[PDB]
């Protein structure tokens, strides 16, 4: 019996329409896509950063490791 003992609510009217009287995916352009961008925008700078900073570390350590495999001529400039 979880519905009815939830909370004390007063003076709130809500209006909704049967699903068959309205569109399933309305205003894809005018409304939808703009918010998708809005949201992407909002977060991009909180998320992306640390990911990009990881990418570097990856790329750096990944290559620096390869560099440590190649030889350095300065070890043989007299090995005749």
């Amino acid at each position: 019996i979880h519905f009815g003992n939830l909370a004390r609510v007063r003076h709130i009217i809500t209006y909704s329409l049967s699903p068959f009287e309205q569109r399933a995916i309305p205003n894809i352009f005018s409304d939808a896509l703009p918010n998708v961008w809005r949201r992407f925008s909002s977060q991009v700078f909180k998320v992306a950063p640390p990911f990009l900073g990881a990418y570097l570390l990856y790329s750096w350590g990944t290559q620096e490791f390869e560099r440590l495999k190649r030889k350095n001529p300065a070890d043989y400039e007299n090995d005749q």
Partner: protein
């Protein structure tokens, strides 16, 4: 007109106007327990 009505007639007429239709609903007061138009809409069909 009333003696003309038989069960069979009632079913066909009610089905015609009730069955699977999307209804209008008005709720006033401590209505938390009654809910979801969806659920109510699905109550519009199957015995």
């Amino acid at each position: 007109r009333i003696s003309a009505v038989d069960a069979r007639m009632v079913r066909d007429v009610c089905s015609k106007y009730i069955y699977d239709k999307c209804p209008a609903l008005a709720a006033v007061g401590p209505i938390e327990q009654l809910l979801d138009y969806n659920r109510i809409r699905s109550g519009m069909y199957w015995i």
